[PDB]
Amino acid sequence: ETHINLKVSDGSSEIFFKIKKTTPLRRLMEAFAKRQGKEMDSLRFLYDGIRIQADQTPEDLDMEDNDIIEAHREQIGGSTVVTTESGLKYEDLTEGSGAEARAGQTVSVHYTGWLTDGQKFDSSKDRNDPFAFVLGGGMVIKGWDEGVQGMKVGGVRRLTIPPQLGYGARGAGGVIPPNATLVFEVELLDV
Template sequence: MKKILPAALLPIVICSSVSFAQTRTGRRTARKTTTGKKYAPPRKKKMENTNNAVTTPSGLTYIITKHGTGREVKAGDTVEVNYTGLLTNGAMFDSSLNRNETFSFRVGAGMVIKGWDEGLQHLRVGDHATLILPPGIAYGERGAGGVIPPNATLIFIIEVVGVK
């Protein structure tokens, strides 16, 4: 069952991860969304390769969708990321992109949920990745702020911007 759930979520994650709008000049720009809104997948977007999905012993599944060339993230590093958080139904509950600012934290210091501390250590600067976190390494039975229900599996689309 643990391996079936992440596999079943992959099409949702891939179709939900990015939404673009076409401008009059033909340039693609990120479409703004608001918390709680569902992403509408672009009609012509090709399904990304999911063969590189990795599931760790904790249940974290990560998929690197774009490989960066920067240094690897290690415990103790202060990492700077852009992220969007989704529920499995596609509803967005948070995004640094909507605030037009990156999010920084020290990896492995317990400043964020366990799935982030673990997941970021599989990435490097420049990586774009999807993290699928089971409840045990997310918010568990308590949920969060009335926005994330108890025992929710969470999906995060992350870009590692920098490491200090």
């Protein structure tokens, strides 16, 4: 009766908040922002398609248990998902600036990879260590050699990789199953 549970989805993962219906959503927004290393005014929180104001409360918005808040931490408002001739899907979430990565260059990125059920299988951020590779050199799965081309520093791009451009029927490490579609969020840090 007094409290409410809310899902916040940022496009890649979901986390839950229990909050009193009389607490301003500022506390939820600040709690979510702190996880991303950002201040809440630099994130866009939407409920039923409408931007949430910090001094609004869940009662003010007539929210109900297990409602969803959409959180956008990246820079582009209204992105588009591109499907290429290979079946690779990619979505630019932040454009970045400067030179564009091209084949033969060594690029350094941060990434997180998830299965489509939401299970994370690896993240360079969990080691606080960027990952580098020679773009186009066949040293990573094919979906990455294709999908990281054209990125600029600061750019954040979400890749959805069909298994034939990933680990295929083999899978990987007892963690990625056979024929898994792979989702990566990639931030280009240096080229």
